[PDB]
Nucleic acid binder design. Sequence first.
RNA 1: GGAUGACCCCAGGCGGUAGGGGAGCGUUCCCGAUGCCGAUGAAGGCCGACCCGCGAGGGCGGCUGGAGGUAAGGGAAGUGC
RNA 2: GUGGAGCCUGGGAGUGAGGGCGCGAGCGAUAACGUCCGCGUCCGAGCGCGGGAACAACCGAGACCGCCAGCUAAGGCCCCC
RNA 3: CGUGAGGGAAAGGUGAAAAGAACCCCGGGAGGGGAGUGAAAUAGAGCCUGAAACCGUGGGCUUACAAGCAGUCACGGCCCCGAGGGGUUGUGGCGUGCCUAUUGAAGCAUGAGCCGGCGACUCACGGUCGUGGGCGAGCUUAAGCCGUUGAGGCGGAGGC
Lengths: 140, 116, 59, 154, 112, 101
Amino acid sequence: MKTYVPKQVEPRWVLIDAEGKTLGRLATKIATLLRGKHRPDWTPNVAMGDFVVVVNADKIRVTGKKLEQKIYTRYSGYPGGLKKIPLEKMLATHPERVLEHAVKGMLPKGPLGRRLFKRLKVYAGPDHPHQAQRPEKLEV
Amino acid sequence: PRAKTGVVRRRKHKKILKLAKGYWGLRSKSFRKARETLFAAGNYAYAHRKRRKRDFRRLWIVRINAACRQHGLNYSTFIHGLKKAGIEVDRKNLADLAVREPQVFAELVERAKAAQ
Amino acid sequence: AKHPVPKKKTSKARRDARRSHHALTPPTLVPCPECKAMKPPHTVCPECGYYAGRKVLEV
Amino acid sequence: RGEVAYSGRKIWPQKHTGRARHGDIGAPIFVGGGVVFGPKPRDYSYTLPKKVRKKGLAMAVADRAREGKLLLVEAFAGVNGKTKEFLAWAKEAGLDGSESVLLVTGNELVRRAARNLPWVVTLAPEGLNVYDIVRTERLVMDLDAWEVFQNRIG
Amino acid sequence: MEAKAIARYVRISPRKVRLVVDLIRGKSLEEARNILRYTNKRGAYFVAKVLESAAANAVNNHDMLEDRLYVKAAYVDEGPALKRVLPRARGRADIIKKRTSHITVILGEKHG
Amino acid sequence: MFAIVKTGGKQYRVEPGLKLRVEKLDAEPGATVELPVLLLGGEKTVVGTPVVEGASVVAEVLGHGRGKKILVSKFKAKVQYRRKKGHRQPYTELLIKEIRG
RNA sequence: GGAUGACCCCAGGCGGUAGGGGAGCGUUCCCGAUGCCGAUGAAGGCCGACCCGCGAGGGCGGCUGGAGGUAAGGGAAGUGC
RNA sequence: GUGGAGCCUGGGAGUGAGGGCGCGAGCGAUAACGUCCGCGUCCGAGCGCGGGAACAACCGAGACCGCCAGCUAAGGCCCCC
RNA sequence: CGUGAGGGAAAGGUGAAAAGAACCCCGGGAGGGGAGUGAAAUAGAGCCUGAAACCGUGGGCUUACAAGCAGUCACGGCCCCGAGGGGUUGUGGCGUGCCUAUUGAAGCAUGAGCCGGCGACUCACGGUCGUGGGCGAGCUUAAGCCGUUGAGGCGGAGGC
Ligand SMILES: [Mg+2]
Ligand SMILES: [Mg+2]
Ligand SMILES: [Mg+2]
Ligand SMILES: [Mg+2]
Ligand SMILES: [Mg+2]
Ligand SMILES: [Mg+2]
Ligand SMILES: [Mg+2]
Ligand SMILES: [Mg+2]
Ligand SMILES: [Mg+2]
Ligand SMILES: [Mg+2]
Ligand SMILES: [Mg+2]
Ligand SMILES: [Mg+2]
Ligand SMILES: [Mg+2]
Ligand SMILES: [Mg+2]
Ligand SMILES: [Mg+2]
Ligand SMILES: [Mg+2]
Ligand SMILES: [Mg+2]
Ligand SMILES: [Mg+2]
Ligand SMILES: [Mg+2]
Ligand SMILES: [Mg+2]
Ligand SMILES: [Mg+2]
Ligand SMILES: [Mg+2]
Ligand SMILES: [Mg+2]
Ligand SMILES: [Mg+2]
Ligand SMILES: [Mg+2]
Ligand SMILES: [Mg+2]
Ligand SMILES: [Mg+2]
Ligand SMILES: [Mg+2]
Ligand SMILES: [Mg+2]
Ligand SMILES: [Mg+2]
Ligand SMILES: [Mg+2]
Ligand SMILES: [Mg+2]
Ligand SMILES: [Mg+2]
Ligand SMILES: [Mg+2]
Ligand SMILES: [Mg+2]
Ligand SMILES: [Mg+2]
Ligand SMILES: [Mg+2]
Ligand SMILES: [Mg+2]
Ligand SMILES: [Mg+2]
Ligand SMILES: [Mg+2]
Ligand SMILES: [Mg+2]
Ligand SMILES: [Mg+2]
Ligand SMILES: [Mg+2]
Ligand SMILES: [Mg+2]
Ligand SMILES: [Mg+2]
Ligand SMILES: [Mg+2]
Ligand SMILES: [Mg+2]
Ligand SMILES: [Mg+2]
Ligand SMILES: [Mg+2]
Ligand SMILES: [Mg+2]
Ligand SMILES: [Mg+2]
Ligand SMILES: [Mg+2]
Ligand SMILES: [Mg+2]
Ligand SMILES: [Mg+2]
Ligand SMILES: [Mg+2]
Ligand SMILES: [Mg+2]
Ligand SMILES: [Mg+2]
Ligand SMILES: [Mg+2]
Ligand SMILES: [Mg+2]
Ligand SMILES: [Mg+2]
Ligand SMILES: [Mg+2]
Ligand SMILES: [Mg+2]
Ligand SMILES: [Mg+2]
Ligand SMILES: [Mg+2]
Ligand SMILES: [Mg+2]
Ligand SMILES: [Mg+2]
Ligand SMILES: [Mg+2]
Ligand SMILES: [Mg+2]
Ligand SMILES: [Mg+2]
Ligand SMILES: [Mg+2]
Ligand SMILES: [Mg+2]
Ligand SMILES: [Mg+2]
Ligand SMILES: [Mg+2]
Ligand SMILES: [Mg+2]
Ligand SMILES: [Mg+2]
Ligand SMILES: [Mg+2]
Ligand SMILES: [Mg+2]
Ligand SMILES: [Mg+2]
Ligand SMILES: [Mg+2]
Ligand SMILES: [Mg+2]
Ligand SMILES: [Mg+2]
Ligand SMILES: [Mg+2]
Ligand SMILES: [Mg+2]
Ligand SMILES: [Mg+2]
Ligand SMILES: [Mg+2]
Ligand SMILES: [Mg+2]
Ligand SMILES: [Zn+2]
């Protein structure tokens, strides 16, 4: 006999409240959902996981002094192009990137790794436009 | 008597270049680069034969660990249940039973939680 | 100068990739309203000899 | 490389020519140059112990003697140097021509006849050798030839 | 039915000729004749003659209609090289390869 | 019904009618054998610990074979070590007749 | 075990450079050969997912090719890039 | 203590540039991917495998071949994994 | 090639037989397409066989968000030959060319554009071990002479 390989799944849509949950401790699970490792038929070479709709990523919370201390970095390719952004200001400017940057770096690198990052759709504020898919609200 | 090469070398090169069909550029067309390629291939196949038994067992586990948590226990706790229950169903069929016949996998969960 | 020299032999793939812009564009031709033959636009027709509607040169 | 025709000039210098280093073009590394350990005229002969060639000669006859393919004839009647004579004689002697025969006799005429038969090797008894014995499925001998056969292995 | 013409040992570099032969492949005969007339290339001359010799064969030998002709196939295979000497500076002598080509045109009847 | 049986050091799921290749079993072609059962499933569901008492899967051996030749070669660079080895792992083809159990 | 390599069984060893040993494949040539394969196709070339061999190799079939090839068993080297 | 143990006579070698690590000293500066010895070790030749992000010599462990079977070693068990 | 002494290549093969392609067609010719010869004309004289690198045409599969010693393992899609295979490769896993020299090389150390052919442990004589045999306190001949014309025998000088 050989290992069962699933006929192409119909992916599930998932809605997570991000408010007040810890940044890395929510990120690691959303990666597991994206990766589909909660699925008994999990196949490592295909896109299989859910579509994780997250809201209130502006109200994500982090411990310690990481608001002033944790610094997201961007390099441009030009001399002196090392830009530094504290988690503070990024929350004030592009709060959806905090979760995305965290969740991205916990996903594999490569083709499938990026296809799954396209499946995470982060929003600030309690609303989301994906009511067309009717995502099952998950308590995580 | 004189024994020139004659038919020998080309036949041995035709053996190697045939085993290199499908390779990129001179790797499939040039005997020398076909050799250096077929060396690497011969080692990779021996390793990935060994790595294959490693690959699927890990794939079996991740699926086993997935269907376990749908019942409320993790992989580690489940496996030890099967050991104390005395069930030697391996991880290939375990994961197979998890997707196809979950009612059997559900029963196997009970025996694992009850062996505790 | 110190005589720059190619480091590695260019691949068949790479040189043919370079020549992906080398295809000739066909000559652009329009019919001559007098003798209908295909001539280049804005040129005295080389088959009958007409242009603008009148005879210009011998053929 | 010293027996080849070319001269002993160093074709180009040792260094700075940008080309591999070489001497004369008689070197075997060149096409047309000499050969390295190719054959020379050899004398392949060697002196086998007489007692071995003597024992070989006797043993070779013995192998034919065991399987019945040894025949000593008193003489060869109606053969006087013509082949077709020897043919009819072989037909009386139980030699049809289906077994290769070593004919050993001192008679030139009998030897003259069978000479050109494809299945017959001819020999003077002094020329009795084990190769021609082993080659032949059968062995026929003048009692002249048998006599001197005993003499050599004495 | 197909017709064929070959111009063997055409003293011109094949790489230069294929540039022109690409223009006419799959094209109708009259179109190709028009295309070859105004392509500003030395090779357009030769391609035009092999084409006209192939079209002549079809009509004359192979019972094919002139109006129904198109260029079913066309390819430039390289022939022997004319290796000539180019004296460079400093006493070095390079070897120029003056290249020939075998130009093939294959015609067929496009029915419409 | 189906059954997880163990032969040749491995476990396979079998059903009536199925063909499979297991490690070479010492049996005559056309004969039949009883495979030890580790789990039954389908209508009923019985769990082996590790095996089951009156459980056996009957299989008729259709014949023994030699798999497609696999080349196993070893190459150690810069050390002039090369080895070529050809392997045809033997097998036995079985038809799962009935599941007793 | 059977009786001196018949095969069977049981157990253990088997990473390997310099290097020592053993057993084999292939190439040219001699004997075998006044034979044998061969125009119903030699050698060589091109294929093949087929058969055998741990491998080096051997077959076998299809195509080319258009006159040579050469067995079991031995012998000798200009013998494997 | 029967081990690819030991001993005796012979044939054939290769080696006679070592290197890191632990301990013991010397030279050095209680410097050096330092240098020179002693004991051991591994690489050398195990740049085959697991760990150590990656990395000959640190930890684990001596790869005859096959398996989509099982148990462990160092090390690991939030995600990459 | 060199003032000269001197150095010193390359280059063989249609077919049994020229029967070496009248004549017709495109073209200036070259070349080709027919007709013709031939068992064969991808035997057409740039001629047996016609390998490889190399170049081209056509078809199947594939490729424009992708990080690579180019493979390999797995799975999937497609195409072909018909619970099986072969071709292709989208994704995932793993993955530091070959040789040489080194304590140590993927190594930013050596060598190699690629392909084909050529290319390197031999022979003689002695020596010394081992080994297969002949004989055995013995063993053996050398040059030669005789014989055969791919026949062997003689020869005891001498040597151990
Ligand atoms: Mg990874
Ligand atoms: Mg050679
Ligand atoms: Mg090729
Ligand atoms: Mg267990
Ligand atoms: Mg200047
Ligand atoms: Mg310059
Ligand atoms: Mg190309
Ligand atoms: Mg390019
Ligand atoms: Mg000389
Ligand atoms: Mg001199
Ligand atoms: Mg120099
Ligand atoms: Mg150079
Ligand atoms: Mg030289
Ligand atoms: Mg020269
Ligand atoms: Mg010569
Ligand atoms: Mg005769
Ligand atoms: Mg004979
Ligand atoms: Mg005679
Ligand atoms: Mg050039
Ligand atoms: Mg039973
Ligand atoms: Mg390596
Ligand atoms: Mg080394
Ligand atoms: Mg090596
Ligand atoms: Mg056994
Ligand atoms: Mg064993
Ligand atoms: Mg070894
Ligand atoms: Mg060993
Ligand atoms: Mg015959
Ligand atoms: Mg031959
Ligand atoms: Mg073969
Ligand atoms: Mg053939
Ligand atoms: Mg003849
Ligand atoms: Mg042969
Ligand atoms: Mg022979
Ligand atoms: Mg033989
Ligand atoms: Mg040689
Ligand atoms: Mg020892
Ligand atoms: Mg000793
Ligand atoms: Mg010794
Ligand atoms: Mg020394
Ligand atoms: Mg030392
Ligand atoms: Mg040491
Ligand atoms: Mg310590
Ligand atoms: Mg040091
Ligand atoms: Mg130190
Ligand atoms: Mg070394
Ligand atoms: Mg190591
Ligand atoms: Mg390395
Ligand atoms: Mg590691
Ligand atoms: Mg071992
Ligand atoms: Mg072992
Ligand atoms: Mg375990
Ligand atoms: Mg995990
Ligand atoms: Mg001159
Ligand atoms: Mg002169
Ligand atoms: Mg001829
Ligand atoms: Mg003509
Ligand atoms: Mg005819
Ligand atoms: Mg013709
Ligand atoms: Mg021919
Ligand atoms: Mg010819
Ligand atoms: Mg011939
Ligand atoms: Mg060809
Ligand atoms: Mg070719
Ligand atoms: Mg193409
Ligand atoms: Mg992107
Ligand atoms: Mg795309
Ligand atoms: Mg890519
Ligand atoms: Mg997989
Ligand atoms: Mg397939
Ligand atoms: Mg990778
Ligand atoms: Mg060096
Ligand atoms: Mg060095
Ligand atoms: Mg050094
Ligand atoms: Mg480099
Ligand atoms: Mg250097
Ligand atoms: Mg290098
Ligand atoms: Mg050096
Ligand atoms: Mg060059
Ligand atoms: Mg070569
Ligand atoms: Mg020697
Ligand atoms: Mg000796
Ligand atoms: Mg001796
Ligand atoms: Mg003796
Ligand atoms: Mg004597
Ligand atoms: Mg004679
Ligand atoms: Zn006009």
